[PDB]
Amino acid sequence: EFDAIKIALASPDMIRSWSFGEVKKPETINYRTFKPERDGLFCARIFGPVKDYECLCGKYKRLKHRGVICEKCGVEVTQTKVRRERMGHIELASPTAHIWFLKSLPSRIGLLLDMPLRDIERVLYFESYVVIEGGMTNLERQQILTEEQYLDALEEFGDEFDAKMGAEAIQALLKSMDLEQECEQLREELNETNSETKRKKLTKRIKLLEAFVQSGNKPEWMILTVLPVLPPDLRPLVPLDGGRFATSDLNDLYRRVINRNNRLKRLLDLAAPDIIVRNEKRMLQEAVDALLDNGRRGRAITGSNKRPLKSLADMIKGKQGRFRQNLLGKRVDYSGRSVITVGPYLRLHQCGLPKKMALELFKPFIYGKLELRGLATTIKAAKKMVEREEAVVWDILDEVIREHPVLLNRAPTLHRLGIQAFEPVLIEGKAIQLHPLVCAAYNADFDGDQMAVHVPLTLEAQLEARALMMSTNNILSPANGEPIIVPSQDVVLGLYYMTRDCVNAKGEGMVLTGPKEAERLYRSGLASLHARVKVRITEYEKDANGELVAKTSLKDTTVGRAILWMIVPKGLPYSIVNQALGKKAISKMLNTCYRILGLKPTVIFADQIMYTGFAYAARSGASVGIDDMVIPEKKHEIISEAEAEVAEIQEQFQSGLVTAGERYNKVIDIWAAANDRVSKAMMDNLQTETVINRDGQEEKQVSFNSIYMMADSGARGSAAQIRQLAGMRGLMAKPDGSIIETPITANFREGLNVLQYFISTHGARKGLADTALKTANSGYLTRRLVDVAQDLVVTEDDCGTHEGIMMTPVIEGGDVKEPLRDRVLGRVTAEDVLKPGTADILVPRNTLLHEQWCDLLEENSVDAVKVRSVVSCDTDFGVCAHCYGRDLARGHIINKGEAIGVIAAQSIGEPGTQLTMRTFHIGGAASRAAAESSIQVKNKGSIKLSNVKSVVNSSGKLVITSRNTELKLIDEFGRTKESYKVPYGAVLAKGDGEQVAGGETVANWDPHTMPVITEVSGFVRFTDMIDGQTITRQTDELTGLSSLVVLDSAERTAGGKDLRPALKIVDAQGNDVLIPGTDMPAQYFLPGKAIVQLEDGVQISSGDTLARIPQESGGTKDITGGLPRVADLFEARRPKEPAILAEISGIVSFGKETKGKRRLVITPVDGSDPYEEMIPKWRQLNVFEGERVERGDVISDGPEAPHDILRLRGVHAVTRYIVNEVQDVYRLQGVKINDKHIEVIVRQMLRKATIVNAGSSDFLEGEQVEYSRVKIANRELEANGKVGATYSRDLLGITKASLATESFISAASFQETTRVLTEAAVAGKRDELRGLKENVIVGRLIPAGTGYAYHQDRMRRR
Amino acid sequence: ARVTVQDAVEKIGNRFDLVLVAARRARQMQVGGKDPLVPEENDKTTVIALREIEEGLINNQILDVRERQEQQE
Amino acid sequence: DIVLNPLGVPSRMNIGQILETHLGMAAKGIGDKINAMLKQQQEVAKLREF
Amino acid sequence: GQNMRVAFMPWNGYNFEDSILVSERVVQEDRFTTIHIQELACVSRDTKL
Amino acid sequence: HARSTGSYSLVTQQPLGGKAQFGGQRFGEMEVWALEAYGAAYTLQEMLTVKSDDVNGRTKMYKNIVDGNHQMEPGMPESFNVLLKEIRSLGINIELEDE
Amino acid sequence: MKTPLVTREGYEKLKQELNYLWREERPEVTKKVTWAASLGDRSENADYQYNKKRLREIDRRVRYLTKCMENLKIVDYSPQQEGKVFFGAWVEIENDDGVTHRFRIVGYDEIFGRKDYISIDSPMARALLKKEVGDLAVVNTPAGEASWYVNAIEYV
DNA sequence: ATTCAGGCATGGCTAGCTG
DNA sequence: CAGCTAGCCATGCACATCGCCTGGAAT
RNA sequence: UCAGGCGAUGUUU
Ligand SMILES: [Mg+2]
Ligand SMILES: [Zn+2]
Ligand SMILES: [Zn+2]
């Protein structure tokens, strides 16, 4: 029917073209004869009739007269719908300032006139004056004025001179203004600018102006001359029970406006004094302000009782306007809801449903099949039959449900499992029955939850629900490849007790021909359910070219385990079920099954497991008894000794050897130690407590205590809970956070005196409050993410490129945290991978990676892999297939079209509730601080030096004399795997070429002191060293020995203010000592405020530390929070004290000193030198003068700025940074998330860009634009013979890159409305659909799934 | 008589065009005549179409062929 | 008459209901004992002592 | 409420998560039957016409 | 509780809410996200067009259901038409365009 | 309030304890939490709750030890200069009534009763920053003033 | 029977003080 | 004439449900 | 049949 929506401003001509009539009077209705008032806010001769095709006069009442108006009251006859389309207007005598264009912050009018908003307010509220066409007089044009000044001027120049006040003046101004000359002069000025803030203001202004010109608009239209009224229906007048009517809001508002307008109109006849009409106009302006946005001026007008009545701004804004309430989620017919229960007799592709619900749902289908089989003539008797509920209907309903899937929904839908499908099977009762093995995916216990049904209607819909959402086709959460059909909590106890072993029970020591007769024994009751036995079993294996082959043998197993064997399908090995079968075991069982035998076997195997599990668990009967939580016989004595210890410490305190917090910490530590001892005691007294005879004497074994089983299985609870049932329940914090100083020496089995229970209450209540607030923030995060990645759909097949990124296994210097196999699985090769038999290619460059290829990589010690990412595709508007890898939740590569943005968003959002809120994330320096003073090699290999300048002292150790050196890790091949800096004067435990292993500490120093290492041995004198003048002899209490502290120029004397303290090596006598080999003197000169420890008459070595450089370093990484850390990382906030970096490669120097702060300058090798920047010198400097480095290098420390990282290092670098960071923040809390999704979010984060040189293009220089547009532009530009364009990618926070989008309705449905609608309105911004949320709004298809085929056909149409 | 669609996914490697193909065949069977090509089992057109797909004798190609052959008239 | 789920007890650390169950068992024990002693109608002195 | 004999043991799934199970010996003696009372109102307005 | 075809609200021709008022459920925003997550599209279309908004839509739908022919005809929603009117209430001019 | 002065042996011991906590203790509780999360309920579950509590408690310890290791001034001074009692010294003190005591003076982090267990900020040490063998020294206990006498000193 | 008095976090902006 | 710079506003705050209650004062 | 108040049930450190 149509295409792209368009939006613009409105002219009075446009409005009068819109409306059909004109309002005059404020009345509403009679209250007496409920026919509407004449010519008012409900008038047929304006809006239209009430009853279909019946004039209010009561003359014509039949379609015979369709289309003619009345003559006594003059009303057109038409369907009553029209009162949902026609519209009306109002005549305002005075003009009126619209308000969105006045207080949007920025102010459109405001910067249009280049005028202070305050004074513009003053004008529009009648407390000032302003000039228009001052002429050849003393005054100016924009010159605002006050009362007495106006009076004096009129006294002196009451002539042609003109100034006014009120909206008319704004109107005259704007209508007078031109735009061409404005643009010319402003461009002149911008050529002539030199100040950046001025440039910023002027460039905003010029952008707005040139846009306002390009679009076909006229500024004066920003001032309402004629206001349109909303149609009648949309402001309905509902009657209440009683002779009253439910008052709306828009009615009251319009009525107020019309009263005020009519009063003013009456006032312009008597020519009353002007103060009156001024007060009048002020009232009217404030009223129209109220109607458009009640609540943006001062105190908002109230309504009936106390609250701001709702206005149109609220009709659209907020969590309750139209967008988030009636266009993104609509209530829907054909549905219902009820309570759930279990019903384990179901195969997991079917679910219960109650008769009465069904017979209410499928009423249409029933009607149809009825009149098809010919049992009622019309629909009437049909409905009568289906209400009376006679016989045949139930059979009919069975015939129509048989194969007609349905959808089940639960309330807090987080991830796309939140809606699955099923087939019905009719049940009695009144409560939905639902299979057990899905109550984990729904995250739905049976404590009284509620679920909703939905019934697809059309045929495409049925096929969708079956081929995509039926439960069998979801055995893997798209978050991460682990299964989701994990058997949950009883079935596990079942299988557990079904497979285990004692040492001696009935039937031990016999042989069985087959699992068949095994089960036969166990039923007959002549052999225990578990007793080790030799049996025969036969297994299958597909080792051939996809072909099954059998082999049989005599295994040693347990009878029950044999019974379990009769369910495993043909293809597994046998060792998968020959152990305890906890929870992890059965999980990887199903997993291997799915990886090796397709899908159908796995489904049927899951069902059989659940059945047999419930059966044998029941036959087992694992209760819980109070005499089965054994308190160890040593709790008493341990608490006794603890009390003795705190008594000793209290004695020592009142004897005077400790302080307050000292006693505090001492006590708390010894209690904690006692706690741990108790825990170990109970765990040993339970887990293996069973000791029995074997037909010999005795031998211990794992126990049969019910609680230990219910824990070791993996069903519920663990060491922690069994602790809080047996041992003391540790310590309890208090609201202050100060942990309390007396433990709770009791436990839930014994009693509790009051105080203890009270304190535990403290704890629990604080917990609940945090649950609430954290939920809130999690939801908000999820929403924001899905509104930024919404518009990304896999749209082609092969970008055909050669870029990528590098993946390496993450190692913390020591242990490897996550292996290369896991970080690579599924994502697709970028280049080829040559074996470490170099010049021998192993795998091709453009291949998928499944598990066999994974193992092939593992079997050759693959160092790193270059892989295709998403963040660097080459697609127009889309993201190509190969660059996205295995779509988790399915085996093969992603299909051409499956949207990814949304699933990615939901996955990064879901676990979010598990994060904390207020802690301090310290996963980023645990190893940094632990390895500051000692360099940590990561992998095995020899030690290589780079630009060595060192010497081995007489102590027998190698120390380096310059920063020029670098560390490399030689491999067994000859390349470089690891690289490291070289601290000045480091300690080298190893040497060069000395083949060593990986992870070995070979260096040490003080990370707070640069050494003053010598070159050779000798003795030291006080060469150029004077106390008071140069140095000071400060006494050092807490070390015995004292030292010499350098007195800087700012503190020392003046006569030696410049004398540089020196140190020359000498012999025992003091002869002249030069540099070894060279004629140059050999005294080292001391920097300022240093600490010399040695004195006269001291022997040193070749490179011995003479003095010490006090080196301060602040590691205040306390900014880290956790969930807000995630927030800020997707926000791109600038951290508090950002570390500055190296603009361009070159040498460095200083400049002016103390301009409030210090300066810095850098000169390239051969480039533009004058670069400088102001540094607050109080920050540390990790740099020296003579140091020459490369662009993008670091200079100071602290956080690392994403902005600068982007603009300096590389897109690969920035994306790697964000992924490592956010992954660590999660994985610290232990939640697996494949990295693809974070990658795709980052991509959408950096979608905009800016220009550098116009080239031959068609843009302004200082202009912002989306990357894709300009790339496709300059591509076809270069296609012919012209010059390209220059640009720069720039990173933006999500809450911004949402708004700054081609489409606008997208934004308009997100987080605010006024800003977006106004900017778009002044822009005149056309908008194609081209996305998802749009098409969901307008209701046509979606370019995501099947809609992808549809939209391609549509685009091909033209 | 249908639980999963794996064989269909195999015979047409899209898992989406499956939907459209099946729907088209189903409309043919429900609106206007054109009796099915497999022994039915008192089952609805939907399952019928998926089944005739996995039998491997219906896809977009054959559909357009037979539509053209009708339109021959 | 009612069969709850054992695995619910260690999870929700409310060990109480198990003690409640035991003590109730004792209660109904005394009850049934008295009921027998009364149905086999006896001299009241036995009830007194018991 | 009332006091009933109870026993803790899994029993063929039907008490999977927290689903109590109840035997007909209860629903016979009417020892959870409840009584509810609703209240319905008709009115007599006097509208023109 | 369950509803097939009952009343309809007056401002925005949508089904009502609650039970006492004989209405139907609510198909939440996050659920629309889910359905977009799967490739399912026709389901979403007739989930928020034929069963909620287009008056002509559901009349046609009902008349077709009663005779076997399972087939929708989308048309335009109506709450959106209301959104158009309430923005037009202000100084703005919003429109559809050429076909 | 504090003093960054620490002895090198305890420094090494503390660093090793840090490494122990961060390598072979964190990941096990990590696995337990990742496990427990896969259960359905979270407010009706306590295993996740208390295991998370364990994480919080170990995190606080590692934070404290980290800041310490950042701000530890080390003085591994030898017996080079001896004659007074200033730091890192074994000290015998006796009462004029028979009460005797042997102890070594160390920094704040080295007080767990085993070998050398007295902090400098204690009034005892504060009255002994430098003394001579055979001298009186008094302190101000909350129950009044006290007195003892030195016996012997051996640094190492 | 008509009528007129307990929040937080963040970002954006504007006078207002040093060179 | 420029670079902060502290102080003052705008805008934001999960989803789903059920029951009950009350909707201008003066002339 | 609309808007508010109140209370309650779920998921939710
Ligand atoms: Mg629940
Ligand atoms: Zn008429
Ligand atoms: Zn690509």
Cα A1217–Cα A1237–Cα A871 angle in degrees, nearest 5: 60
Backbone angles phi and psi of A313, in degrees to 5: -50, -40
Domain extent for B73 = 1-73
Cα A575 to ligand 2 centre (Å): 92
Tell me how far CA of residue B11 lies from CA of A16, A1299, B51, in angstroms.
Answer: 62, 44, 12
Which helix H or strand E contains A409, and what residues bound it?
strand A406-409
- Enumerate helices (H) and strands (E) in chain D, giving the number of each: 1, 0
Cα A657–Cα A663–Cα A669 angle in degrees, nearest 5: 125
* Side chain identity at residue A96, one-letter code: T
Is E39's Cβ below 8 Å from some Cβ in B?
yes
* Side chain identity at residue A1132, one-letter code: A
Among E6, E79, E10, E7, CA closest to E49: E79
Tell me how far CA of residue E25 lies from CA of A355, A456, E2, E5, in angstroms.
Answer: 19, 15, 9, 12
Domain extent for F152 = 77-156
Distance CA A515, CA A521 (A): 10
Query: Which ligand places an atom closest to the C-alpha of A70?
Result: 2
User: What CATH number is attached to the domain comprising F96?
Assistant: 3.10.50.30
Task: Note whether A460 contacts B23, CB cutoff 8 Å.
Answer: yes
Among B39, C8, D33, CA closest to A623: C8
Query: How many Å from the CA of A448 to C1' of I10?
Result: 8
The answer to whether A168 touches A152, Cβ cutoff 8 Å, is: no
Among A228, F44, F3, CA closest to C5: F44
Describe the strand order of the beta sheet including A1031-1032 as a list of residue ranges: A1031-1032, A1044-1046, A1091-1092, A1107-1108
Q: Judging by beta carbons within 10 Å of its beta carbon (0-12, 13-18, 19+), is residue A365 exposed, middle or buried?
A: buried
What is the separation of C-alpha A56 from the centre of its chain, rounded to a whole number of angstroms?
60
- Specify the DSSP class assigned to residue A571: T
The answer to whether A978 touches A1129, Cβ cutoff 8 Å, is: no
The answer to whether B55 touches B38, Cβ cutoff 8 Å, is: yes
Distance CA A41, CA A45 (A): 11
Backbone angles phi and psi of F90, in degrees to 5: -75, 140
- Name the pairing type of β-strands A406-409 and A419-422: antiparallel
Q: What would the DSSP string read from start to end of A418-482?
A: GEEEE-EEEESSSSEE--GGGTTTTT--SSS-EEEEE---SHHHHHHHHHHHBGGG--B-TTSSS
Q: What would the DSSP string read from start to end of A299-341?
A: S----SSSS----HHHHHSTTTSSIIIIISS-B-SSEEEEEEE
SS3 breakdown of chain B: % helix, strand, coil, rounded to 5? 60, 0, 40
Q: How many alpha carbons fall within 13 Å on the CB side of residue A780?
A: 12
At residue A1088, the 3 state secondary structure works out as coil
Which helix H or strand E contains A1240, and what residues bound it?
helix A1236-1245
Instruction: Check whether residue F86 and residue F46 sit in a common domain.
Output: no
Tell me how far CA of residue A638 lies from CA of A643, A673, A677, F113, in angstroms.
Answer: 9, 11, 8, 18
What is the separation of C-alpha A321 from the centre of its chain, rounded to a whole number of angstroms?
26
Distance CA E45, CA A767 (A): 43
Is E67's Cβ below 8 Å from some Cβ in B?
no
Q: How many domains does chain F have?
A: 2
Distance CA A25, CA A323 (A): 33
Q: Give the method used.
A: cryo-EM
Helix axes A363-373, A392-401, angle to 10 degrees: 110
The answer to whether A707 touches A624, Cβ cutoff 8 Å, is: yes
Backbone angles phi and psi of C2, in degrees to 5: -140, 145
- Name the pairing type of β-strands A335-341 and A432-433: parallel
User: What CATH number is attached to the domain comprising B22?
Assistant: 3.90.940.10
* Side chain identity at residue A1029, one-letter code: Q
The answer to whether C3 touches D9, Cβ cutoff 8 Å, is: yes
Q: Tokens in use for E10? A: 């007056």
User: What CATH number is attached to the domain comprising F13?
Assistant: 1.10.287.180
The answer to whether F89 touches F153, Cβ cutoff 8 Å, is: yes
**Which residue's CA shows the smallest distance to C1' of H18?**
E18
**Residues flanking ion ligand 3, Cβ below 5 Å:** A 799, 873, 880, 883
Instruction: Check whether residue F69 and residue F123 sit in a common domain.
Output: no
Q: Which nucleotide does the CA of A247 lie closest to, via C1'?
A: H23
Q: Is E18 left (phi over 0), alpha (psi -120 to 50) or beta?
A: left
Q: What would the DSSP string read from start to end of A694-719?
A: -SSS-EE-----HHHHHHHSSSS--H
Produce one character per residue of F36-55: b if its CB has 16 or more CB atoms within 10 Å, e if not. bbebbbeeebbbbbbbbbbb
Cα A336–Cα A340–Cα A343 angle in degrees, nearest 5: 125
Cα A432 to ligand 1 centre (Å): 15
A and B touching (3 or more beta-carbon pairs closer than 8 Å): yes
Nearest-Cα distance to chain D for C21, in Å, is: 8
Interacting residues of A1251 by C-beta distance below 8 A, sequence separation 6+: A1257, A1259, A1260, A1261, A1262, A1263, A1265, A1270, A1285, A1286, A1287, A1288
Q: How many domains does chain B have?
A: 1
Q: What would the DSSP string read from start to end of A202-266?
A: HHHHHHHHHHHHHTT--GGGGEEEEEEE--STTS--PBPSSS-B---SHHHHHHHHHHHHHHHHH
Instruction: Check whether residue F86 and residue F41 sit in a common domain.
Output: no
CA end-to-end span of chain C: 30
Which helix H or strand E contains C49, and what residues bound it?
helix C44-49
The answer to whether A835 touches A842, Cβ cutoff 8 Å, is: yes
Q: What would the DSSP string read from start to end of F88-115?
A: S-EEEEE-TTS-EEEEE-B-TT--SSSS
Among A1210, A350, A1333, CA closest to A805: A1210
Instruction: Check whether residue F43 and residue F84 sit in a common domain.
Output: no
Helix axes A117-124, A167-176, angle to 10 degrees: 120
Instruction: Check whether residue F43 and residue F81 sit in a common domain.
Output: no
Q: Judging by beta carbons within 10 Å of its beta carbon (0-12, 13-18, 19+), is residue A1356 exposed, middle or buried?
A: exposed
Chains touching chain B through at least 3 C-beta pairs below 8 angstroms are: A, E
Instruction: Check whether residue F62 and residue F83 sit in a common domain.
Output: no
Which A residues 742-801 have CB within 7 Å of strand I?
763-764, 767-768, 770-772, 774-775, 778
Distance CA A1155, CA A37 (A): 77
Q: Is A1122 left (phi over 0), alpha (psi -120 to 50) or beta?
A: left
The answer to whether B49 touches B71, Cβ cutoff 8 Å, is: no
Where are any strands of DSSP class E within A793-845? 805-807, 810-811, 816-818, 833-834, 841-843
Q: Tokens in use for A1220? A: 């490592």
Q: What would the DSSP string read from start to end of A1150-1198?
A: -----SSSEEEEEE-SSS----EEEE-TTS-----TT--B-TT-B-S-S
Task: Note whether A1041 contacts F80, CB cutoff 8 Å.
Answer: yes
The answer to whether A1187 touches A1150, Cβ cutoff 8 Å, is: no
Q: Is A861 left (phi over 0), alpha (psi -120 to 50) or beta?
A: left
Among A826, A880, A835, CA closest to A1235: A826
Torsion of CA A1186, A1192, A1193, A1198, to 10 degrees: 130
* Side chain identity at residue A265, one-letter code: K
Domain A634-766: top CATH class = mainly alpha
A43 belongs to an annotated ligand binding site: no
Among F103, F105, F91, F85, CA closest to F7: F105
The answer to whether A223 touches A166, Cβ cutoff 8 Å, is: no
Which helix H or strand E contains A379, and what residues bound it?
helix A379-388
At residue A97, the 3 state secondary structure works out as strand
| Residue carrying structure tokens 């306007």 | A321
Distance CA A1208, CA A1141 (A): 9
Handedness of CA A870, A876, A881, A882 (dihedral sign): negative
Which helix H or strand E contains A124, and what residues bound it?
helix A117-124
Domain parsing of chain E, residue ranges? 14-99
A241 touches strand I (CB under 7 A): yes
Distance CA D8, CA F82 (A): 75
The answer to whether A1329 touches A3, Cβ cutoff 8 Å, is: yes
CA end-to-end span of chain E: 43
Backbone angles phi and psi of A1271, in degrees to 5: -70, -45
Interacting residues of A116 by C-beta distance below 8 A, sequence separation 6+: A110
